[PDB]
Amino acid sequence: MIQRTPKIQVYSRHPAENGKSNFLNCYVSGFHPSDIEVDWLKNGERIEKVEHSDLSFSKDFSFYLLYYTEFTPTEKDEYACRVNHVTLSQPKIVKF
């Protein structure tokens, strides 16, 4: 049996084929088991966004999730990714 806590990375990318678009990304990497909850916050409040995820796994059965959504960020607005996993006693919130 094995359990591994996720690493969580929050960053923005513009797709090069549509430079004007901007995506908020939450890369949740190396975790086990695969059971997980991930959502978006803004200024602390959950926000309704259109959800996209890519889920894959490696040979040692770690899971990797890219959770991403388009956004138009402000300087004053605080975006964060919130992750709940069996290894985390509290939800982990990672600011953009």
Site of interaction with Na ion (CB under 5 A): 88
Closest CB 37 distance from Na ion, rounded Å:
9
Closest CB 38 distance from Na ion, rounded Å:
12
Our CB check for Na ion shows the closer of 88 and 94 to be 88
Q: Which residues are 66's β-sheet partners?
A: 27, 54
Our CB check for Na ion shows the closer of 66 and 88 to be 88
Our CB check for Na ion shows the closer of 10 and 88 to be 88
**Residue among 4, 73, 89, 86 nearest 40 (CA):** 73
Instruction: Write out the two tokens for 8.
Output: 């969580």
Closest CB 90 distance from Na ion, rounded Å:
7
